[PDB]
């Protein structure tokens, strides 16, 4: 995989960020994670959804460098969002969320599984520590 530079435009949700990527604005869905949503069709505000959202926002808003890493499977979803791992000062946001107990690992989507093990390990640890969603 190759890390590419991007610039924050806006963090939308725990699982979604809008970035400037190769000169054009684009919505990115973070790969392999499911966060509680703030912008859910029904249920509206799920528990820990506002915590996950603020976590993602804080991480990308305070970074001096954002990088996007596409995986080797499909790169956009049916809503047009890019499917990627996002890094803030070298730290993977997708992993930080799971490790903090603020997301679960999602099922693999269309060949995109490069960091699944890494993430599943982070999740097991968060469950063991009974953090946040796992409390």
UniProtKB/Swiss-Prot annotation:
The annotated regions of Basic and acidic residues compositional bias extend over 115-131
Q: Where does the chain bind Ca(2+)?
A: 15, 34-35
Say which residues of the entire protein are included here: 89 to 223 of 231
Its source organism is: Staphylococcus aureus
Q: What is this protein called in UniProt?
A: Nuclease A
Stretches for region Disordered: 115-135
Q: Catalytic residues per the record?
A: 29, 37, 81
* Subcellular location, record wording: Secreted
């Amino acid at each position: 995989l190759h890390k590419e530079p991007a610039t924050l435009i806006k963090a939308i949700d725990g699982d979604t960020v809008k970035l400037m990527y190769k000169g054009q604005p684009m919505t990115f869905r973070l790969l392999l994670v499911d966060t509680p949503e703030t912008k859910h069709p029904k249920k509206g505000v799920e528990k820990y959804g506002p915590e996950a959202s603020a976590f993602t926002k804080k991480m990308v808003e305070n970074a001096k460098k954002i990088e996007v890493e596409f995986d080797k499977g499909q790169r956009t979803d049916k809503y047009g969002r890019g499917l990627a791992y996002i890094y803030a000062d070298g730290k993977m946001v997708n992993e930080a969320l799971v490790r903090q107990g603020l997301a679960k690992v999602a099922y693999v989507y269309k060949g995109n599984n490069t960091h699944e093990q890494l993430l599943r390990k982070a999740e097991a640890q968060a469950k063991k520590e009974k953090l946040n969603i796992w409390s």
